[PDB]
């Protein structure tokens, strides 16, 4: 199976600057062109940059916005993807993945087109400064039913990427977590679980909060 | 550059329907026109590339066709796992161009929402914050209102509202409405209503706590 796992990800001032890294497995990755395409967050697909195989002299190219800015390169005999990232802006804040392009043209056509990818890693361009979330529980106020619902509200963060599981993800299929909003300054969002109601409060519910950018875990247990 | 420009950027089928989604290119393109799909986690993968080749693993009722400018991707039965937004990309020339997507929505039965209130935390008290959340759960369609009432009385400032994506499993969305209010306004109310209105009843779904 093809893996491309991107990273280096993160909050970086504008006018900074920033490395992006891409480890592939599952595939000779030396044969291939390979791609960065990026998506701006609620946005499209938009393609970044291309490096050819050796044996077309690793040629590049660039997207209008980003050529001059941008420097794409790769490293054969470990098959890692690089994207260096210059004098960014507001702009080029976006979900980057690694992407590998189709193989021979005489079987899959000269037209360019892109048959794995990476799940992606989050580039934030902004002045404003990281800080974690203040976690509180949300634990009903009233009378129970068959099911029970409980939840964690995620408050005071930036940038944007926390993590909601539930009793470490062992608590999976009625979760609903709620796409966080700009307060502005700072991000909010909550999760929610719905258990059925002899589950709790007699087993333990707890909903972990993990923000990289300040790495930052939280655990909060659900009182009644 | 080449744009590339997708039929709409939304529609909405029922399982078993047949789906047709459009693209077109501003210059001709010579059949290297590609499809993609993105879940609503994000995950990418490739459908149809050359205009009708189907990548080998994907499902036959994808398939492809069209030429020139003008291009299509068909889905012939509509399958619960569809639920995505549809990407086409053109591959003559640099640069590789994407149309703006299609978001595809399944449309399932009627559903009405469950209600829950939750007061804010005692740790948040503490804090000097009071936000008052309620969440509006696996409902469908849509479109519902959500009103909150203190003491009786509407209000409307400090409301935030916030829409799940279509859930992959059963095509109901939620929503979380979240009342933020200073502690010390908090403190001179006592009854806190979240009011829900839905199609699938005449009567508001109503939830309530005082704060004693």
């Known amino acids: 199976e093809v893996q491309l796992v991107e990273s280096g990800g993160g909050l970086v001032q504008p006018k900074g600057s920033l490395k992006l890294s891409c480890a592939a497995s599952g595939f000779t990755f030396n044969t291939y062109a390979m791609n960065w395409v990026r998506q701006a967050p609620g946005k499209g697909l938009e393609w970044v940059a291309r490096?050819?195989?050796?044996?077309?002299?690793?040629?590049?190219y660039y997207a209008d916005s980003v050529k001059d800015r941008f420097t794409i390169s790769r490293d054969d005999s470990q098959s890692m993807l690089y994207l260096q990232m210059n004098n960014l802006k507001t702009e080029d804040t976006a979900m980057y993945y690694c992407?590998?392009?189709?193989?021979?043209?005489?079987?899959?056509?000269?037209?360019?087109?892109?048959?794995?990818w990476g799940q992606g890693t989050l580039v934030t361009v902004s002045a404003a400064k990281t800080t974690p979330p203040s976690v509180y529980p949300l634990a009903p106020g009233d009378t129970t039913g068959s099911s029970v619902t409980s939840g964690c509200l995620v408050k005071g963060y930036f940038p944007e990427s926390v993590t909601v599981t539930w009793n470490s993800g062992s608590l999976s299929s009625s979760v609903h977590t709620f796409p966080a909003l700009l307060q502005s300054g700072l991000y909010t969002m909550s999760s929610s679980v719905t258990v059925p109601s002899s589950t709790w409060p007699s087993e333990t519910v707890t909903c972990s909060v993990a923000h990289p950018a300040s790495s930052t875990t939280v655990d909060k247990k659900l009182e009644p | 550059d080449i744009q590339m420009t997708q039929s709409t950027s939304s529609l909405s089928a029922s399982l078993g329907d047949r789906v047709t989604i459009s693209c077109r290119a501003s210059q001709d393109i010579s059949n290297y026109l590609n499809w993609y799909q993105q879940k609503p986690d994000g995950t990418v993968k490739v459908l149809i590339y050359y205009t009708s080749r189907l990548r080998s693993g994907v499902p036959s009722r994808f398939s492809g066709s069209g030429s020139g400018t003008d291009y299509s991707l068909t889905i012939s039965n509509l399958e619960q796992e569809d639920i995505a937004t549809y990407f086409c990309q053109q591959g003559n020339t640099l640069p590789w161009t994407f149309g703006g997507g299609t978001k595809l929505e399944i449309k399932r039965a009627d559903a009405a929402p469950t209600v829950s209130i939750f007061p804010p935390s005692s740790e948040q008290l503490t804090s000097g914050g009071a936000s008052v959340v309620c969440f509006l759960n696996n409902f469908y369609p849509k479109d519902i209102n959500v009103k909150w009432k203190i003491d009786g009385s509407e209000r409307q400032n400090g409301v935030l509202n916030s829409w799940t994506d279509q859930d992959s499993k059963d095509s109901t969305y939620s929503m979380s409405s979240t009342l933020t209010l200073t502690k010390d306004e908090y403190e001179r109310h006592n009854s806190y209503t979240c009011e829900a209105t839905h199609k699938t009843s005449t009567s508001p779904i109503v939830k309530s706590f005082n704060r004693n």
């Open positions: 992407v590998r392009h189709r193989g021979a043209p005489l079987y899959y056509g000269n037209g360019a087109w892109f048959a794995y």
């Open positions: 490096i050819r195989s050796k044996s077309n002299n690793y040629a590049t």
